[PDB]
């Protein structure tokens, strides 16, 4: 019930996380998370209904999506929690993240295929089934399409933004949510997807297990923003067309509101989270 920095996992925790992810894949459950995410990112538009992306509910929606996935992991092995990837710190291909005992490395030159780790196509254990093209193998090009992951100083600049979100509550917004998402400013969350490349750069980005670790750290940064800004909170707070207001429920669950997801501590804690 503690989410830990990936860099701190023990060999046994890495093993159990890998095995639980692979069992959700085998049983068919994993692919439906990939599908859900793609459906939402293909439908979340700036000029219409938007829930999982490009909108204030980007953060609570991914928080609940990650909770669904973590609960599915825990049904296979109750000891497993989602770890997080602090990409401001572990910013090279040399990070133990990308070691063959954890997620495997970058893809080869020719076709971007990941050739090592538990998710390499050659293992037979990670078919890419939910996809936008014919290729059925995990791909990555770490640092190929953008040179650099965000730095801590860039992160700090975003954490300093006091307003949670602003009209028009889309990819054009000023404020924290859209700078954290990355459509404006120095670009945190979007740029990491682009830096990993392969399926992580696409609508079917949960095909790469690093998806979860990236979003767990995005989620941690929301929690950090909250501590920096106890006087700020989720907006909008009612009556906003096409956007999920604080007390409105969110699709696909329909039974939970951003209000139910602001306080992570109802569901989990971090290994380390600074006091305000």
């Amino acid at each position: 019930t503690v989410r830990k920095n990936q860099a701190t996992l023990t060999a046994d925790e890495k093993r159990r996380f890998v095995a639980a992810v692979l069992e959700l894949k085998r049983s068919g459950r994993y692919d439906e998370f990939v599908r859900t995410h793609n459906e939402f990112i293909m439908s979340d538009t700036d000029s219409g209904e938007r829930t999982g992306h490009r909108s204030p509910s980007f953060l609570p929606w991914h928080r609940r999506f990650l909770l669904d996935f973590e609960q599915a992991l825990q049904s296979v092995d109750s000891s497993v929690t989602l770890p997080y990837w602090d990409w401001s710190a572990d910013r090279t291909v040399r990070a133990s993240l990308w070691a063959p005992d954890f997620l495997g490395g970058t893809g080869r030159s020719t076709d971007g295929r990941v050739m090592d780790g538990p998710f390499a196509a050659s293992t037979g254990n990670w078919p890419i089934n939910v996809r936008v093209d014919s290729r059925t193998y995990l791909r990555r090009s770490l640092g190929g399409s953008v040179a650099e992951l965000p730095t801590r100083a860039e992160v700090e600049s975003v954490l300093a933004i006091s307003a949670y979100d602003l009209p028009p509550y889309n990819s054009a917004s000023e404020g924290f949510r859209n700078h954290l998402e990355g459509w404006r400013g120095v670009n945190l969350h979007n740029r990491v997807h682009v830096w990993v490349g392969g399926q992580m750069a696409t609508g079917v980005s949960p095909n790469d297990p690093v998806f979860w670790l990236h979003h767990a750290y995005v989620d941690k940064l929301w929690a950090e923003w909250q501590r920096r800004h106890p006087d700020s909170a989720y907006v909008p707070t009612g009556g906003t067309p096409d956007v999920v207001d604080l007390n409105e429920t969110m699709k696909p669950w329909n039974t939970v509101r951003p209000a139910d997801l602001l306080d992570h501590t109802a569901y989990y804690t971090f290994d380390a989270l600074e006091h305000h």
């Binding site: 793609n38 293909m42 093209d133 054009a172 979007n190 682009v194 750069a201 609508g203």
Partner: protein, 72 residues
């Protein structure tokens, strides 16, 4: 006011775009694309990476695909 249509061969592949609110095709297979508020574009195979135009999104898809057929 939609962008103009286009049709060219880019890296051996035919990319087409036309207003619909805008459709893109790679070798006759529709590619999901979306316009951002600021006028930039993305496709489903580059969905976190804004590019200025639909043709730019089509070319980015051809770059991404490395010869692979798109799936509907």
């Amino acid at each position: 006011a939609a962008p103009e249509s286009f049709d060219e061969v880019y890296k051996g592949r035919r990319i087409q775009g036309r207003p619909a609110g805008y459709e893109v095709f790679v070798d006759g297979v529709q590619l999901h694309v979306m316009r951002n508020a600021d006028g930039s574009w993305i496709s489903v195979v580059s969905h976190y990476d804004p590019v200025p135009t639909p043709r730019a999104a089509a070319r980015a898809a051809v770059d991404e695909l490395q010869g692979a057929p798109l799936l509907p």
